[PDB]
Design a protein around this ligand. Sequence first.
Ligand SMILES: CCCCCCCCCCCCO[C@@H]1O[C@H](CO)[C@@H](O[C@H]2O[C@H](CO)[C@@H](O)[C@H](O)[C@H]2O)[C@H](O)[C@H]1O
Ligand SMILES: COCCOCCOCCOc1ccc(C(C)(C)CC(C)(C)C)cc1
Ligand SMILES: COCCOCCOCCOc1ccc(C(C)(C)CC(C)(C)C)cc1
Ligand SMILES: COCCOCCOCCOc1ccc(C(C)(C)CC(C)(C)C)cc1
Ligand SMILES: COCCOCCOCCOc1ccc(C(C)(C)CC(C)(C)C)cc1
Ligand SMILES: COCCOCCOCCOc1ccc(C(C)(C)CC(C)(C)C)cc1
Ligand SMILES: COCCOCCOCCOc1ccc(C(C)(C)CC(C)(C)C)cc1
Lengths: 69, 56, 55, 103, 56, 63, 114, 97, 96
Amino acid sequence: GELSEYVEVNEKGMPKPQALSLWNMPYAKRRALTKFARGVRWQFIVLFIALYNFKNRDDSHLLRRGAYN
Amino acid sequence: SLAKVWMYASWIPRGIPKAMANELSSAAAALAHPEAIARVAQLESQGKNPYRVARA
Amino acid sequence: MNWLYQMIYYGVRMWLVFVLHSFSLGSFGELITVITDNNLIFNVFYIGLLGLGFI
Amino acid sequence: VYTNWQSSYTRLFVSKPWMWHPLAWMTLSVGIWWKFGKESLCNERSFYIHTHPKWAPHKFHTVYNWSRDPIKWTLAEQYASIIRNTNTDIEAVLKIKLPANAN
Amino acid sequence: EFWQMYLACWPYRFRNTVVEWETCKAKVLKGSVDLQDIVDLLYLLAWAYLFWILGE
Amino acid sequence: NLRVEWEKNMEIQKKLHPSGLWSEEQAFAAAEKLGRPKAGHPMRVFEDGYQQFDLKPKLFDPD
Amino acid sequence: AAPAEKPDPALDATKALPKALEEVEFFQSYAVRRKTGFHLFNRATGSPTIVGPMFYNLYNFVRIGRVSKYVCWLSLPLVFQRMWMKNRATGMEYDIDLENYAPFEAKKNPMHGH
Amino acid sequence: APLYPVLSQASLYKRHFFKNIKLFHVVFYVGAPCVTFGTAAWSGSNRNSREAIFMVIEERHGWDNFKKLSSHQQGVIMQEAAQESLLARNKGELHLP
Amino acid sequence: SSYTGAALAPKSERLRLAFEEKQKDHQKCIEEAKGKGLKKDELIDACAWTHRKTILALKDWFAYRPPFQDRRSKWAEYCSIRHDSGSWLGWSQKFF
Ligand SMILES: CCCCCCCCCCCCO[C@@H]1O[C@H](CO)[C@@H](O[C@H]2O[C@H](CO)[C@@H](O)[C@H](O)[C@H]2O)[C@H](O)[C@H]1O
Ligand SMILES: COCCOCCOCCOc1ccc(C(C)(C)CC(C)(C)C)cc1
Ligand SMILES: COCCOCCOCCOc1ccc(C(C)(C)CC(C)(C)C)cc1
Ligand SMILES: COCCOCCOCCOc1ccc(C(C)(C)CC(C)(C)C)cc1
Ligand SMILES: COCCOCCOCCOc1ccc(C(C)(C)CC(C)(C)C)cc1
Ligand SMILES: COCCOCCOCCOc1ccc(C(C)(C)CC(C)(C)C)cc1
Ligand SMILES: COCCOCCOCCOc1ccc(C(C)(C)CC(C)(C)C)cc1
C-alpha cells in the first residue's frame, strides 16, 4: 500500500502512523510547524531556484547601454 | 596410439563434405521413388554399378 | 506518466533487440564468410544446405 | 432487422470507441509530424540534414555526393520553373539596400 | 527414370567411396595390384589432374 | 598472397595509398597524371539545416 | 473486494507443453525411414553427427510442399556466382592511378565528406 | 419460394475457391517467390550491387563517359567495379560500416 | 577558447548582413553566367538557387520586427527575462 496523499484513520478520528509518529508533541508546537506549511513542496524549491537566479541574473545588456555609468 | 593421432588429424578434413553427402543421401531416400531405391539395392546385390546402368 | 515511460521503454527495447541481434548475426556471418573465402577448402556447405538454414 | 453494421457506418463508429482509436491515432501521428518533423526535416531550409552521416546515415544508399549535389539542382530546377511561371526578374533582388534599425 | 535413379544412386556412391578407398589401400599395401586396377587408377589420375586444373 | 605482397610493396614505397586510407599526395599525383580534377572539399557544413541537431556546432570564420 | 471466484481450469497451464510436444512428435514421425538406401557419414570417432540424421525429415517435408520446393532453389545459383566473382576479385589487376585517385570506400576521402 | 437472389451452385463452387484459403497457403506460397526474388536474395543483391558499381564508375571513369561507351565495355567496367566492391580491399574485405 | 554567451550583432543587423552575403553570392553567379554568355532563360536555371537564398534571407528580415519600447519590456530587461509585451495571457494567448 502506502498510497500518495492518503491516510487511514482510527476509531478516535486520528491518523494512524504509517512511518513516523508526530502526535505526541503538544498542539502549540504542531500549529507552529504547520501554520506556514502548505500542500505544496516542489514549487517552493523551484521558486528558491528562480530567486537565486534572479539575485544572480545578468545585467551585461544594461552595461552595454550605459545604465551603470 | 598412432591411429588416434591419425583420427584427430584427419577429423577436420574428412568432415567437410560429410554434411552435403548425408544431405544428398537423405534427400535421395526421401524424394526418390522407393522402387528406384529397391532396384539400386538389387543391382548392387548383383555386383553391378547401378549409376553406370542408369547412365547407359 | 509511468504508462508513457513503459511504452517508450519497451518500444525502444524492441527496436534495439531487433536491430542489434540482426546486426550481430549478420556480422558473425560475414566474418565466417571472410574466413572461408580466403580458405576455399572450407568454402563448402559445411553444415548443410537446410541444416544451418532450418536451425 | 436493422443494424448499423449493415445500414449506417456513422452510428456504428459513434457506438464503438475501438473505432475511434485508429482515427485518434492517425490524428495524433499527423500532429506529431506537423509540430516536430515538418519544419525540422521536410522544409527546404532544413532538408540538407538528410546529407548528414550521423543523423541520416545512408539516406541516399551511400554517403551524400556533394560534388554532384542532387538536392541543389532538383530544387533549382523547381525554383526556375516557379520563376518562369511567375515571370519574376532574377536581378531585381540585387537592387535592394536594406536599412538598419539604428540606435 | 534417370532422375530417380540418379537420386537413388547417391547413397550407393557415398557408401562405396570408403569401400573402394579401403580396397585400394589394401591392394597397394599388400601389393596385390593387377592390370585392371592399374587401368582404373590411371583413369582416376587423369580425371583428378583435369579437376586439379579446373580447381586452379 | 601475390596480390597482397604486391600491394604491400607498393604501399611501402608510397606508390599506393595505405589500406583503408585516402592519401593526399598519391591522389593529387594520380589526378595530375590522368589529367582529372583534383580532390577538393565539396561539402558545406554551413548549409541551411545541416548541423542543427549538432550539440557542438562549427563556427564560421573567414581564414 | 472478496468476490470468492472458483478456480477456472482454462486459466491453468497444463496443455501448452503437451501441444508443443505433439507438434514436435508429428514432425519427428516423418523422420521414420527404411533400412534400404540408408547411409550417413558419421564422425571420425564413429559417433553420429547432429544435422546428418535430421535431413531426411526436412526433405520428406520438402517433398510435401507445392511451390517452395520448386522456387526456393532459384536463389542458390547466386551463391556460386559469389563464389566465382570473389575469386575473380582476389587477384584482379587494377590501375594504381585510379586506386589512388578513386579508392572504393576508403577513409578520409573529402569527396565523400570525411 | 425463396424471396432472395438465390445463388447458383457453380457460383458458390467458384467462390469456395477464393474463401477456402488457409493462412499457410498464403504465407509460404507468397514467401517463396518473395524470399527468392526479394530484398534478401536476388532483387536486393542486384539493386545493391548497382549502387556500388555506379559509385565506382562515377569516381573512376565518369557517368557521362560511361554512357558514351558501348554496352559491352559498359558491362566490362561494371563487372570490374562489382569485383572491386565485393572484394572491399579497403574495409579489410568486410562489408561492415 | 570558447564561451556560451550572447549573439554578437543584433537580430536586425544579423539578418541584414546575411541578406548582403546572399546578394553577393547571387551577383557572382549572375556575373559568371553573363561571362559564359547565357541568356535570361538559361540564367534563371543557373542562379535560381542563389535567388531563392536571397529571397529567403529577405523573408527572414521582413518577418522580424525589432521590439517596441514600453514599460513592460524595460521591466523585463531589468529582470533579464524573455518577455512579450503584447500578451495578456502568455503561453495561453496562443489559444485565446
Ligand atoms: C550566515 C552568514 C553567511 C556568510 C556568507 C554569505 C555569502 C552569501 C553569498 C554571496 C555570494 C554572492 O554571489 C555573487 O552574487 C553576485 C550578485 O550578488 C553574482 O553576480 C551577478 O550579479 C551581478 C550584478 O549586476 C551581475 O552583473 C552579474 O552578471 C551576475 O553574475 C555573482 O555571480 C555571484 O558570485
Ligand atoms: C593406358 O594403360 C596402360 C596400362 O599399363 C599397364 C602396365 O602394366 C602393369 C601390369 O602390372 C602387373 C602387376 C601385377 C601383376 C601380377 C603379378 C599380380 C599378375 C596377375 C595380374 C596375372 C595376377 C601383373 C602385372
Ligand atoms: C590428387 O592429385 C591429382 C593430380 O594432381 C597433379 C597435380 O599436377 C600439377 C599440375 O601443375 C600444373 C599447373 C598449372 C598448369 C597450367 C596453368 C599450365 C595448365 C593450363 C594451361 C591448362 C591452365 C599445368 C600444370
Ligand atoms: C516452450 O514453449 C512452450 C510454448 O507452448 C506453445 C503452445 O502453442 C502451441 C501452438 O501450436 C499449435 C498450432 C495449431 C494447433 C491446432 C492443431 C489446434 C490448429 C487447428 C485449430 C487448425 C486444428 C495447435 C497448436
Ligand atoms: C511448429 O513446431 C514444430 C517445430 O518442430 C521442429 C522440431 O525440430 C527438430 C527436428 O529435428 C530432428 C531431430 C532429431 C531427429 C531424429 C534424428 C529424431 C533421431 C533419430 C531418427 C535417430 C531417432 C529428427 C529430426
Ligand atoms: C495453376 O493454375 C492456374 C490456372 O488454373 C485454372 C483453374 O481453372 C479451373 C476452373 O474450375 C472450374 C471448372 C469447371 C467449371 C464449370 C462451370 C465448367 C463446371 C460445371 C459445368 C460442371 C458447372 C467451373 C470452374
Ligand atoms: C518454433 O516455431 C517455428 C515454427 O514457426 C513457423 C512460422 O510459420 C508462420 C505461420 O505459419 C502458420 C501457418 C498456418 C497456421 C494454421 C494452420 C494454424 C492457420 C489456420 C488457423 C488458418 C488454420 C499456423 C501457423
